[PDB]
Design a protein around this ligand. Sequence first.
Ligand SMILES: Nc1ccn([C@@H]2O[C@H](COP(=O)(O)O)[C@@H](O)[C@H]2O)c(=O)n1
Ligand SMILES: Nc1ccn([C@@H]2O[C@H](COP(=O)(O)O)[C@@H](O)[C@H]2O)c(=O)n1
Lengths: 326, 326
Amino acid sequence: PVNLIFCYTILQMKVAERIMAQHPGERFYVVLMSENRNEKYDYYFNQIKDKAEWAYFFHLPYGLNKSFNFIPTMAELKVKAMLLPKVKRIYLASLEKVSIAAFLSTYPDAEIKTFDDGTINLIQSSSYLGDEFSVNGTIKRNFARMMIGDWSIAKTRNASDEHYTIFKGLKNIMDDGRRKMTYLPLFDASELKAGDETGGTVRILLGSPDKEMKEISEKAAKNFNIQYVAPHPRQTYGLSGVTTLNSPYVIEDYILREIKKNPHTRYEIYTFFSGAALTMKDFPNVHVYALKPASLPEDYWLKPVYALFTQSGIPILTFDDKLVPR
Amino acid sequence: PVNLIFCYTILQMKVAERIMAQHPGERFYVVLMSENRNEKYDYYFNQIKDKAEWAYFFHLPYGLNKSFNFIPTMAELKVKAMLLPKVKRIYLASLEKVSIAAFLSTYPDAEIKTFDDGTINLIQSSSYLGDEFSVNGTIKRNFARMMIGDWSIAKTRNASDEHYTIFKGLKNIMDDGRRKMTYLPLFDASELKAGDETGGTVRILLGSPDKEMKEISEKAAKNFNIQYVAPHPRQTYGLSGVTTLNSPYVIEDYILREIKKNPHTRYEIYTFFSGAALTMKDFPNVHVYALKPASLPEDYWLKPVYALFTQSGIPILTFDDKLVPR
Ligand SMILES: Nc1ccn([C@@H]2O[C@H](COP(=O)(O)O)[C@@H](O)[C@H]2O)c(=O)n1
Ligand SMILES: Nc1ccn([C@@H]2O[C@H](COP(=O)(O)O)[C@@H](O)[C@H]2O)c(=O)n1
C-alpha cells in the first residue's frame, strides 16, 4: 500500500523529501518529470532516490509544458508562445482519448480523429455486461468496469468526428452514431500474382508474447508438424525444436513478401487467437487456424474472442496438448 | 499548421503511415509511446521517421498502461492486476492535477494532496482579470485564459483535501476554502549560529535562465561590484567578468552551508526578481535586492511580481544599465 509523489522541479523534490521524512513509516514511489538534467537536478534526484522505495526520472523533450511553475516575464511568455506548433488536427487511438485527454484539451480547436487501438475495439459495449464480467470483486468485473468507463470517455469527451477501423465487416465499439466510420485496409494483397497451390506447404506458428504459453507452443509445433515460429513483437523467450523466423517485419508484411516470391506455396498460420488471424483471413494462399489447448480452462479466452473468430470463418481446433510428450 | 499522430503499437504506426501517405501535402509530427523496443518496433518507427516532418519515440517504463489494445486472456488480466501497486495516496504539484488528471482518475479512492508548483501559486485569481491581462489577442490574455482554466480544474476536479505551500504569509491561489492550507517551511535556518556582521561582505548575483539577460547581468555585476554569480539551475550560458559558483546546490542550500561556516559574513543577494528572494528573505545575515533594469519596459515583469516583492519587504532597485559600459 504505497504513496506516489510527482515532481517537475527541484524545489518540488525538496518538498517531496520533507513529506517523506515526516512519514518515515510509509512507502514512497517518486517520479520526477523534467526537461532539464544536470548536476543540480541529479543531486536532488539522488537524494530522493536514496530515501524512496522507488524513484524514476522521466527526461522529457523540451517544450512539452505550455504553463509555468514560476511567474513568467513577457520575454518567457513570448518565447513559449512562438515555440508552440500550430495544430490543425490530431489523430490517435480511440483509448488514447483517455490517456492523453489532458493534452487534447490544450488544442480545443483541433479536429480530432481516431483509429482502432487493436482488437479491443471489436468487443461491443453490451458484452461488457455479460455474465462473464458480472461477478463482483473478480478480475473480470474490474476489467469490464475499467473498459466501460474508458469507452464512455473516449466516445463522449473531446468530440472526434471520424474513426478509422482496420477490420472489415466487424462491428466497432466506436460505431455509436457520433462519428463517421471509415474502413482503412492496412494490407495490400492485390499485386501478389498468387496462383494455384501446387508447391509445398509452409506452416508457421504465431508466437505468444506470454512466457507461460511456451510449453503449449512447443507441443503445438510437434503435434501439427509446424516447422517455423513467427515470434510476437513483444515476445522475449525462445521455442525449442522449432525454427524461429528472425525478421524486422510483423507477420502480415512478412507473409505478403513471401506470397509474392512464392506464388504457388500454401501458407498455413496457426495461432492461439492472435489478432493477426483477423487481418490475414483473406490473404490468398493463406489458411489460418486458431488453437484451443484442452489443458486451459474454457474461459482462458473471453467469450467475444470465440464469437469473433467463428464470425470471421476462422476454424477453431481443439488441441489435446496433454496427449503430446514433454 | 501541423497534424499530430499518437501511436502506441506497431499496427497503429502502420495506420499512421497510411494516413500520412493519403495526405502528402500536409505536415506531420508523429509520437510513438511504447514499453517495448526491438527491431520490429524500430523498423516501423524508422519508416515513419522517414515520412514525417518530425517523429519521437518515448520509451516508457514497463507497466504504466492498465488497459489493453488487444483482447486480454485471463492470464494477461491476472498478471496486470497483480503487477499494479496498491495506492493509498498521491502527492503532486497543484497544476499537475491538470497535466496528470488522467492518471489520477485511475485511483479514485486514493487520497490526493497538493503542493505549490512554484511562485505561480502566489498570483491570486482576481489578478488574472487585471487590465494587464484583458487586451484580446495578446500573449498576456492567452496566458491568463490558460491559467484561469487550469486553476479551475486543479481546484474543482479530483478533490484533494490539503495543500502544502512553502511561502509564509502570502495568499495562495489554492486557498479557496475547499482544502486545508499547510505551511511547509523548506529551509532550516535555526542551527546556523549566525552572529554580528563583523567580517566581509559577499555579493552574489542570481543568474537568469534566459540568455537575453546576459548583457544586463554582466552590467549589474560591474555596477554593484558583485564578484560572484549563482547560475540558475536551467541556465545554460556563461557570464564574463564574474566568478561563477559551480555547485550541485540550489542557492538556498548553498547559502545555509555558507552562513554556518562563515557566521560573521554579510551575504547580499542580487536578483532580477527570482522566487529565491521570497524563500531567503528571513535567512540571517542575508540581504536580498531585486534589480529592475531601466532598459526593459515597465511591464517586462507582471504587476503581481512587484506587489509580491514589496509586500515581502524586498527592496526593488532601479538600475540604469544603459549608464554602464559594454
Ligand atoms: N506472432 C505474432 C503475433 C502478432 N503479430 C502482430 O501483432 C499484431 C497484433 O496481434 P495481437 O492482437 O495478437 O497482439 C498482429 O496483427 C500482427 O501484426 C506478429 O507479427 N506476430
Ligand atoms: N540563480 C538562481 C535562481 C533560482 N534558483 C533556485 O530556483 C528556485 C526557483 O527560482 P525561480 O522562481 O526564479 O525560477 C529558487 O528558489 C532557487 O532554489 C537558484 O538556485 N539559483
